[PDB]
Every structure is written in C-alpha cells, then in structure tokens.
From a paper:
Kinesins are a family of microtubule-based motors that play important roles in intracellular transport and cell division.
Remarkably this structure is isomorphous to that of ADP-kinesin10. Therefore, an ADP-kinesin-like conformation can be adopted both by nucleotide-free wild-type kinesin and by the T92V mutant. In contrast, the temperature factors of the P-loop are much closer to those of the central β-sheet both in ADP-kinesin10 and in apo-kinesin in an ADP-kinesin-like conformation (this work).
Residue numbers in the entry: 7 to 122, 124 to 236, 252 to 325
C-alpha cells in the first residue's frame, strides 16, 4: 500500500434519463467529488467524459512499467452493477479508441518487449472466475472448483489452473475472447451471472538477461469484481478488510478471509502496486449505492 484509489463517473445512460434522474455529482479540483454536500477525496477523480486513454494513463500505465521491473501488481474495478466496471476494464476489446485497461496493458507490454536484445521474455496468462467463493477456469470448463495452495517459497497459486504461453497481443486477446465464450457454459443468463461473479485475468512476465543471467518475474492481476450493490459479497468484504488492514499499517493482513484475497496475496499490499478504480453512476437514483462505493474507496486512506 502502494494502494491508489481512483473514482470514475460515467455519463447518465438513456434509462436514467428516461426515468427523470438528475446528475448529482459535483467536482472540485482533480481529486474530489461532492455528493450531498460531503467531499470525498481520492488519488484521482475522472469525470463523466474521461476517455479510455486518460484512465489507462493514470490508473495502469505506471503499474505496467513496474511489472516489467519485476514487481507484482493488481488493478481492480469496483462498483455497483452497470456503473461501468466492464467498460473500464475491457471496453471494446479490439477498438483502438474504445478499448479498456486490459487490452491497453497487453499492447504496452509487448511494445516494451519489442523495444528491448540480450533480454529473453516468457509471458504466461491465466483466466478464471470466482462465483460463490468457487474458482472456475475460464480456459478449461472441466475445472470448476479449483483450490488455492501455497508453494515452498510461500507464493500462492491456483492448483491446476490453465496457463497459456503467449507471444503476441493478438494471442492474448484471442485468449480473452475464448474465456468470455467459455464463461457462458452451464450459465443460464450471462448478464446476471457476470454481475454476480468476479473475473480475474493474470499476466505473468518473466525475463532473463542472457549476458548477466539476472532473472526477473512479475505478475499482474486484472480484476473485474462482482457488483457491490441481503449480504455483502464474501470476496468484497474480504477485500475491504485487507485494504483497511494495509491502510493502517497492520503487520497482519487477513488475506485468508477469501480465496480471492489468498490468490492475490503476493500482488496486493506490501511491495506490490495496486490501483482500485471505483466506478459510479452520477444518477440521483443511485445516490446511496454511490455513497457506499465512495466509502469503500476511502478504506485505502492511510492512517
Ligand atoms: Sr464471492
């Protein structure tokens, strides 16, 4: 921590306008939003017309550089259903202007790599979903209840999760498209299922300098969380407890409160780099969920 929080408001959608909703967010400077006369400050606040490129530049581009220096990292999208999480994390996957964080990260990683001579790179990706605290491999639909374990050096791993070596951004994008298709298997209503489950995309960048033999490894987890809007989702409550513990400098961090936070243990907090993008509707209709989303983001404020 090493945890940054950035708030992204989207425009009102046509359904909110058809209902007669009002735009209730006000902005001060670049880092504060006011709701019902209360200010909420973050590392950055994105207004409703912020482009995909600006969001990537502020939220993710530095973390990509760090992963290529051998750090681990995580980027989360958090917020109520329809607040813009998937538009932020994925966008229009193949459109140069509309693409989201994930395809831009893939582009930058490979462009950086192409720009290196004595360095040798190995890139691996995995893609899974957490639904009801159960891990399902999006690259192998026969693997639906995977367990979390620790290795001998104590690094977490998902036992038996598919790993795919990739050598081009199009290979990565093809892998994401395959996972999105496989996600439909044994699922009645995809849209509802997606809003109630977490998708986790892992990119593992390993490198060795062949003339000095130094090796570096970095893992970047990209997480599109379930809707935060009767219980709080178990992964989300675990995530809040972990962020709050890190924010107060606690020696003990309760990663074991969920499978998701156990998986991310070496890529969330400590020496790892993290950005949480909280996504919000500006609608008067969603005011109390927006308040709750902003309060979740303030968990990261260091005390
Ligand atoms: Sr869950």
């Amino acid at each position: 921590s090493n945890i940054k929080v950035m708030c992204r408001f989207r425009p009102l959608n046509e359904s909110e306008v058809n209902r007669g909703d009002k735009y209730i967010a006000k902005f001060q400077g670049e880092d504060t939003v006011v709701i019902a006369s209360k200010p909420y400050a973050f590392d950055r606040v994105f207004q409703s017309s912020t482009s995909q490129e600006q969001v990537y530049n502020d939220a993710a581009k530095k973390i990509v550089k760090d992963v290529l220096e051998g750090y681990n990292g995580t980027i989360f999208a958090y917020g109520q259903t329809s607040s813009g999480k998937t538009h932020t994390m994925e966008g229009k996957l193949h459109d140069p202007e509309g693409m989201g964080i994930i395809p831009r990260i893939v582009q930058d990683i490979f462009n950086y790599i192409y720009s290196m001579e004595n360095l040798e790179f190995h890139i691996k990706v995995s893609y899974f979903e957490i639904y009801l605290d159960k891990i399902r491999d999006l690259l192998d639909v026969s693997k639906t209840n995977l367990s979390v374990h620790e290795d001998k050096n104590r690094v977490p791993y998902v036992k038996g999760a598919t790993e795919r070596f990739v050598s081009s951004p199009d290979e990565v994008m093809d892998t994401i498209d395959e996972g999105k298709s496989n996600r439909h298997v044994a699922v009645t209503n995809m849209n509802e299922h997606s809003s109630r489950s977490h998708s986790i995309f892992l990119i593992n960048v390993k490198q060795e300098n062949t003339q000095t033999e130094q090796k570096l490894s970095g893992k970047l987890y990209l997480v599109d969380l379930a809707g935060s809007e009767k219980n709080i989702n178990k992964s989300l409550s675990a995530l809040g407890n972990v962020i709050s513990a890190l924010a107060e400098g606690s020696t003990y961090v309760p990663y074991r409160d969920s499978k998701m936070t156990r998986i991310l243990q070496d890529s969330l907090g400590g020496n790892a780099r993290t950005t949480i993008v909280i996504c919000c509707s500006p609608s008067s209709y969603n005011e109390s969920e927006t308040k709750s989303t902003l309060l979740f983001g303030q968990r990261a404020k260091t005390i």
